[PDB]
Amino acid sequence: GDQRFGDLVFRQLAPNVWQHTSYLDMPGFGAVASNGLIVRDGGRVLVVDTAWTDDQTAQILNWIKQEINLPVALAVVTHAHQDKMGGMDALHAAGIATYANALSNQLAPQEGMVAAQHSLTFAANGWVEPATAPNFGPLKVFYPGPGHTSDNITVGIDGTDIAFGGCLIKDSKAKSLGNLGDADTEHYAASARAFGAAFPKASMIVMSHSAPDSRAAITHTARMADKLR
Ligand SMILES: O=C(O)c1cccc2cc([B-](O)(O)O)sc12
Ligand SMILES: [Ca+2]
Ligand SMILES: [Ca+2]
Ligand SMILES: [Zn+2]
Ligand SMILES: [Zn+2]
């Protein structure tokens, strides 16, 4: 029951939650998928992660316009790499307020990305400092520690069973942790387990590069990351 709009695929996960999937056309290689989320919060919409490109990101917004027809209040993007912040200019062109870890914003130039307009900061226990995430509705933002990158954050959707691991979590049948070029191999396993512990009741785990999985994705990612040490 998936829907396509241009280059994007949408899947409804819950009454008020959809997964957006965008594809990098990677000369000579297969299209590479990356997933994010769209959340309807009463009379507004909230977005987690851009698509790979600005053009693809404008497609997300147009699909929202057509299928949900509520204003998009804000987006949270989950680290400074192309699949998560590639479409920043498109969000800003559309007048969507954007939030990212302060560290994502600092790293953004050196990663080729455009910084968000607002910086999230985090306590020692990983939870976002609430003053930096005003009016986030059901979005619960958690920094689990360095793993896939030093800046990677995660989001839980209150009132649902869903939590989003972004590129930190890989699916439970995975044979590898994907792109480790900017990874913290020492702390990765702890950071994956911290995500699990922050959202103990989530039973649907959404991630960047596989279809939604159960909590098995968390423990399997940790067990793989254990061997990086
Ligand atoms: O950056 C790119 O051009 C790129 C090109 C092809 C694959 C990927 C995967 C990425 B991630 O965030 O999952 O570390 S970034 C990336
Ligand atoms: Ca751009
Ligand atoms: Ca890099
Ligand atoms: Zn990445
Ligand atoms: Zn990724």
Swiss-Prot record:
Positions of Zn(2+) 2 binding: D83, C167, H209
GO molecular function: beta-lactamase activity; zinc ion binding
Residues bound to Zn(2+) 1: H79, H81, H148
Regulation acting on activity, per entry: Inhibits by captopril, thiorphan, dimercaprol and tiopronin. This enzyme is not susceptible to inactivation by the beta-lactamase-blocking agents clavulanic acid.
Keyword line: Antibiotic resistance, Hydrolase, Metal-binding, Periplasm, Plasmid, Signal, Zinc
Record EC number: 3.5.2.6
Enzyme class, broadest EC rank: hydrolase
Compartments in which it is found: Periplasm
Cofactor(s) the record lists: Zn(2+)
Residues that bind substrate: K170, N179
Source domain of life: Bacteria
Free-text remark on how the cofactor is bound: Binds 2 Zn(2+) ions per subunit.
Chief location category: periplasm
Gene Ontology biological process terms in this record: antibiotic catabolic process; response to antibiotic
Any one of the GO CC terms: periplasmic space
Catalytic activity line of the entry: a beta-lactam + H2O = a substituted beta-amino acid
Extra remark beyond the main annotation: Enterobacteriaceae carrying this gene (identified by PCR) have been isolated in Sweden, India, Pakistan, Bangladesh, England, Scotland, Northern Ireland, Australia and the USA. The organisms they were identified in were K.pneumoniae, Enterobacter cloacae, E.coli, Proteus spp, Citrobacter freundii, Morganella morganii, Providencia spp and Klebsille oxytoca. In India most isolates were from community-acquired infections rather than hospital-acquired infections, indicating the gene is widespread in the environment.
Stated family: Belongs to the metallo-beta-lactamase superfamily. Class-B beta-lactamase family.
Complex formation: Monomer.
Function: Confers resistance to the different beta-lactams antibiotics (penicillin, cephalosporin and carbapenem) via the hydrolysis of the beta-lactam ring. Does not confer resistance to the polymixin colistin or the fluoroquinolone ciprofloxacin.
Listed name of the protein: Metallo-beta-lactamase type 2
Origin species: Klebsiella pneumoniae
Residues of the full protein shown: 42 to 270 of 270
